[PDB]
Amino acid sequence: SKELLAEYQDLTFLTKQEILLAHRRFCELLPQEQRSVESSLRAQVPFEQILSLPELKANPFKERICRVFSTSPAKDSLSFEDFLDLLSVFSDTATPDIKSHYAFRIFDFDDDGTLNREDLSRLVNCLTGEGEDTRLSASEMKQLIDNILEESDIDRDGTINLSEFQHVISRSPDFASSFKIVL
Ligand SMILES: [Ca+2]
Ligand SMILES: [Ca+2]
Ligand SMILES: [Ca+2]
């Protein structure tokens, strides 16, 4: 199931939490004997259930919306992938972020899903001491890593996951230029 859901993460640039929330909603819109993770990811939700979606309530052309997001020309339904895109457009519970996705993968050296002290050390090391061309000392690197955890490691597990990473660089507009965190 982890590998299966992970595929969608690479396809949409959403966090695992976002995909999980969406998957639960998707399943609840399918037929009872369809909830099976691997089974559900192959099912399609009929427009009936999409039209009554809360985030589409105030939208005119709901019928049009369904047809545009639907990938299968034959059927009048949405696949899980189509559903993710719908939520990315109409719901605050799904916000694609291609920059966070790749930046995270770059610093997650062992590709294990989180940024630990070691991964974070390279991240903060992209910054400078004080002058325009400086390099951090051990203690400065330590403090910077400590500050990131203290401020963004909200599930207090000692690492930074994609969701938390998005918060770490949420105030760094030019982050991708040289991977510098603001402050
Ligand atoms: Ca959205
Ligand atoms: Ca890691
Ligand atoms: Ca964490």
Curated annotation (Swiss-Prot):
SMART domains: EFh. Calcium-binding protein that plays a role in the regulation of numerous cellular processes, such as cell differentiation, cell division, cell proliferation, cell migration, thrombosis, angiogenesis, cardiac hypertrophy and apoptosis. Involved in bone marrow megakaryocyte differentiation by negatively regulating thrombopoietin-mediated signaling pathway. Participates in the endomitotic cell cycle of megakaryocyte, a form of mitosis in which both karyokinesis and cytokinesis are interrupted. Acts as a restriction factor that promotes keratinocyte-intrinsic immunity to human beta-papillomaviruses (HPVs). Keywords: Angiogenesis, Apoptosis, Calcium, Cell adhesion, Cell cycle, Cell division, Cell membrane, Cell projection, Cytoplasm, Cytoskeleton, Differentiation, Golgi apparatus, Lipoprotein, Magnesium, Membrane, Metal-binding, Myristate, Nucleus, Phosphoprotein, Repeat, Spermatogenesis. Changing S70A: Loss of phosphorylation by PKD/PRKD2; in isoform 2. Ca(2+) 1 binds at D108, D110, D112, T114, D119. It comes from Homo sapiens. It is linked to Epidermodysplasia verruciformis 3: A form of epidermodysplasia verruciformis, a rare genodermatosis associated with a high risk of skin carcinoma that results from an abnormal susceptibility to infection by specific human papillomaviruses, including the oncogenic HPV5. Infection leads to the early development of disseminated flat wart-like and pityriasis versicolor-like skin lesions. Cutaneous Bowen's carcinomas in situ and invasive squamous cell carcinomas develop in about half of the patients, mainly on sun-exposed skin areas. EV3 inheritance is autosomal recessive. The EF-hands may also bind magnesium ions in the presence of high Mg(2+) levels and low Ca(2+) levels. Induction: Up-regulated during breast cancer progression. Monomer. Interacts with MYO1C. Interacts (via C-terminal region) with PPP3R1 and CACNA1C; the interactions increase upon cardiomyocytes hypertrophy. Interacts with the heterodimeric integrin alpha-IIb/beta3 (ITGA2B-ITGB3). Interacts with ITGA2B (via cytoplasmic domain); the interaction is direct and calcium-dependent. Interacts with the protein kinases PLK2/SNK and PRKDC (via the region immediately upstream of the kinase domain). Interacts with PLK3; the interaction inhibits PLK3 kinase activity. Interacts with PSEN2. Interacts (via C-terminus) with F8. Interacts with NBR1 (via C-terminus). (Microbial infection) Interacts with human papillomavirus 4/HPV4 protein E8, human papillomavirus 5/HPV5 protein E1, and human papillomavirus 16/HPV16 proteins E2 and E5. Ubiquitously expressed. Expressed in the epidermis, hair follicles and keratinocytes. Detected in platelets and in cell lines of megakaryocytic and erythrocytic lineages. Both isoform 1 and isoform 2 are detected in various cancer cell lines, with isoform 2 being the predominant form (at protein level). Ca(2+) 2 binds at D153, D155, D157, T159, E164. The binding of either calcium or magnesium significantly increases the structural stability of the protein in comparison to apo-CIB (calcium- and magnesium-free form). It is a lipid-anchor. Changing I145A: Loss of binding to ITGA2B. GO terms for biological process: angiogenesis; apoptotic process; cell adhesion; cell division; cellular response to growth factor stimulus; cellular response to nerve growth factor stimulus; cellular response to tumor necrosis factor; cytoplasmic microtubule organization. Changing L123 to A/T: Loss of binding to ITGA2B. PROSITE patterns: EF_HAND_1 (PS00018), EF_HAND_2 (PS50222). The gene is CIB1. This is Calcium and integrin-binding protein 1. GO terms for cellular component: apical plasma membrane; axon; cell periphery; centrosome; cytoplasm; endoplasmic reticulum; extracellular exosome; filopodium tip. Changing F165A: Loss of binding to ITGA2B. Does not inhibit interaction with PAK1. CDD domains: EFh. Residues 95-130, 140-175 form the EF-hand domain. One of its GO terms (molecular function) is protein-membrane adaptor activity. It is found in: Membrane; Cell membrane, Sarcolemma; Cell membrane; Apical cell membrane.
